[PDB]
Design a protein around this ligand. Structure first.
Ligand SMILES: OC[C@H]1O[C@@H](O)[C@H](O)[C@@H](O)[C@H]1O
Ligand SMILES: [Ca+2]
Ligand SMILES: [Ca+2]
Lengths: 476, 478
């Protein structure tokens, strides 16, 4: 059986098959309907940390890759006991292909063995989405596989969508007045225009996914292939990506193809570190005891009580956050409660129009209570949400005595997990490394800003003048 | 006769002898009364390098290509061979030239192939730290060299103090009450403004004590009887609408002449530009002033009166601009060549060292500025500004659109164009992208760096910055 991991960038449960208004995702909805659709799939982090984790079946904090980005060129290697997905598939006789327009691995470590056997051939900043005519199968990775090999393939296929910059879809343009907006962003034309383009970027990648499956079926390789389709983490919106709310962690996960019964919906807890062990099992390999991920499909399935996630340094922004989630409750511990949520991060300021919208509205005291939570000068050390009653996780139960028992249960589960995994995010990075990235990113802001002809100290209201023009040029 | 140029940094007419309440400047007041005090001396620019390149040569910086603060530090651009430094004239006359005072900087926007000074004590960007008033300038290597190797010759000494550049320093012998300082109308009548202002005045008192110490040293050295001293600031005070700008706050400076042959109790109300100090010094020592020199001789038998003073503002650090001013005894004309740029164009120096800039950004957002204070915060500028400094000394009522002053407006506008043609104003020629992008990055870096060092976001809101500024000021002592 061939294996495909089709990885989408920065996307929440915003497909039409997941109940999202307005967006057209016919190809992905059809794959979901023809296989198993997972409603409770969670990444283990919300930015390199998500992909270092799911390529190894280990939380990035367990292998020292918690810091986005880190260990790029300092002689830090994967510990000998930790094998990459493709080392396992190689043993089983697979040839490993790196495909898709991206061509990146985003590991927070180096390797001494190749992650893939063939690829098309640093990925920071804003992405530009190429046209939907990309013939992925006529690129060097797939060309190499067909001409030099028998053997089955394991193929990771990375799409650039739905990363910023968002791209308009004029075949089926979206009405900003009709999209569904989480309660923690302002119901404002700036928000809805940015959000319409996010969903049009999902429509764009849906077309490309349709085009890929038409290429594969004309290859004759679909009959003996299982495809995992999943986001690496939630959508590129202000309180989603980087953070440990469901907007940042919950991702689409569809399992499709060889032997997979159709029209199934799964509501069990799945963490993205579960994809490697499940792939191993599907290919008839034993999962070594060290792997933290669970097998989630088939006779060897192993159910989860909880999923876990971390937030440590992101770009220049230093933080220390951990999450624990069962089916109902989200528990979040901020280890640095004195740091604001809105701690300076060039990426967010540079690419997110809604951040300027909310700093403008916050200064005028125009935010709702839910929207202003993110703009407090400090954080409570613990957050607890009843996601059944509060899916937008805006009502923190952690000081509510009515939930203290659940609070203590998950607090203690966090400690056990950290002890059991020897959480490396609990050790400080060196000053050298922190100051390097501070210098890397604080410069990134002032220059990309000056390039836009803007002052680094630009007021939110002036930035908003620029963003309204940015969005119009985008086409919304 | 010996000549001293005693140069104070960043100071307006904020001495007690000029009428400033609360500040105590007895030493500088005594010298004023014992000499000639000038009420209408103007720098040709409002930052250090362009004002100092100007007065050390007697030429407007725009006339010699030195108009961009900072420029030409290391590019093989030298002074035109026809333009001599003050010390080249002194040397011909037989002076030895000495660079004294805690500074030890020349701040030229050009390199030289001949040393500006014969002896010195041994880049002056950022914030300064004012040393204690126990400085013994004559025990430092420039004066020690002079007396050891150059006895028999008169000296020309330029004595640069660090005051009253930021960072301001408290004076605990005579601390100033912030509720009693006089604040111009274009700054908010606020506790932040007044505390920053008291510290500024207390810095004047600190350098005043140092001037009395220098003159007590000089008297003991037995050299004062054969010396003429020019005491002048290089440009006006380090406040938001003063330094860098062509209003009277950034251009008008104390000027005192004192010493041999200078009769006391004299007050002078004639227009004087700092490019006048060189030729007047040359004439005081018996040198003819070459015809090329733009400065006027303002003292003695060869006094040549001024109809106008001029001033320029081109690039200042990273902030590109192009402004010219013309002033007679009454009217100020100012032409903004880039009227689409705001006054508050980003300048890392201002945002980093000026608490009132954050104050006013916060009050502007809340619509708390008065009309006068809010003028600086417009999104663009009128191309011409005209002020009747007799009726409007704070220069806040722009008459350029008033029909009743069109005759004056066009007179001064034509005079500017005349001057630029006459002097071949080098600031009308754009700098290369390489230069502008070197400095934009040098200073854009500085800002984020110092903010992060301070523990602040480079995007910090004005109100959050005010919390920091309140602690900064308290830690300063006010
Ligand atoms: O950081 C650069 C700054 O350095 C100061 O010392 C100077 O007086 C300012 O005008 C500005 O150039
Ligand atoms: Ca991603
Ligand atoms: Ca100065």
């Amino acid at each position: 059986p061939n294996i495909i991991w089709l990885v989408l960038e920065d996307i929440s449960l915003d497909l039409s098959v997941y109940g999202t208004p307005e967006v057209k995702t016919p190809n992905l909805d059809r794959l979901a309907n023809e296989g198993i659709r997972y409603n409770h799939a969670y990444a283990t982090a919300a930015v390199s940390t998500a992909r270092s984790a799911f390529f190894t079946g280990m939380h990035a904090t367990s292998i020292g890759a918690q810091n986005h980005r880190s260990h790029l060129d300092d002689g830090y290697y994967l510990p000998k006991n930790i094998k990459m997905t493709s080392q396992f598939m190689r043993e089983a006789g697979y040839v490993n292909l790196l495909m898709g327009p991206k061509q990146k691995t985003d590991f927070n470590f180096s390797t001494t063995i190749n992650a893939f056997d063939a690829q098309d051939g640093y990925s920071g900043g804003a992405y530009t989405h190429a046209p939907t005519d990309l013939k992925l199968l006529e690129r060097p990775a797939w060309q190499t596989y067909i001409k030099k090999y028998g053997q089955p393939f394991f193929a990771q296929i990375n799409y650039s969508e739905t990363h910023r910059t968002f791209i308009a879809d004029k075949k089926n343009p979206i009405d900003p007045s009709k999209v569904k907006i989480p309660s923690y962003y302002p119901d404002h034309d700036i928000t809805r225009r940015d959000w319409a383009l996010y969903l049009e970027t999902i429509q764009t990648v849906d077309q490309k996914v349709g085009n890929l499956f038409s290429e594969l079926e004309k290859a004759g390789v679909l009959e003996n292939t299982i495809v995992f389709i999943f986001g690496d983490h939630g959508r590129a919106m202000l309180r989603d990506k980087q953070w440990l709310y469901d907007g940042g962690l919950r991702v689409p996960l569809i399992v499709w193809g060889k032997g997979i019964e159709s029209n199934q919906v799964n509501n069990e807890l799945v963490s993205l570190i579960d994809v490697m062990p499940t792939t191993l099992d599907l290919v008839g390999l034993k999962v070594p005891d060290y792997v933290e991920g669970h097998i989630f499909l088939g006779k060897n399935k192993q159910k989860r009580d909880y999923i876990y996630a971390h937030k440590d340094r992101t770009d220049e922004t230093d933080d220390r956050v951990r999450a624990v989630r069962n089916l109902r409750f989200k528990y979040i511990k901020n280890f640095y409660p004195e740091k604001p949520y809105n701690d300076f991060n060039a990426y967010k300021h540079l690419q997110y129009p809604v951040l300027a919208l909310m700093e403008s509205m916050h200064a005028k005291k125009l935010l709702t209570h839910e929207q202003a939570l993110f703009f407090a000068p400090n954080r409570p050390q613990e957050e607890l949400y009843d996601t059944f009653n509060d899916p937008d996780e805006v009502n923190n139960l952690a000081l509510n005595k009515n939930y203290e028992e659940q609070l203590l249960t998950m607090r203690k589960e966090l400690q056990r997990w950290q002890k059991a995994t020897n959480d490396q995010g609990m050790i400080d990075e060196t000053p050298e490394v922190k100051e390097y990235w501070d210098d890397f990113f604080k410069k990134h802001y002032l220059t990309q800003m000056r390039l836009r002809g803007l002052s680094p100290k630009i007021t939110p209201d002036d930035y908003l003048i620029f963003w309204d023009k940015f969005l119009t040029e985008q086409g919304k």
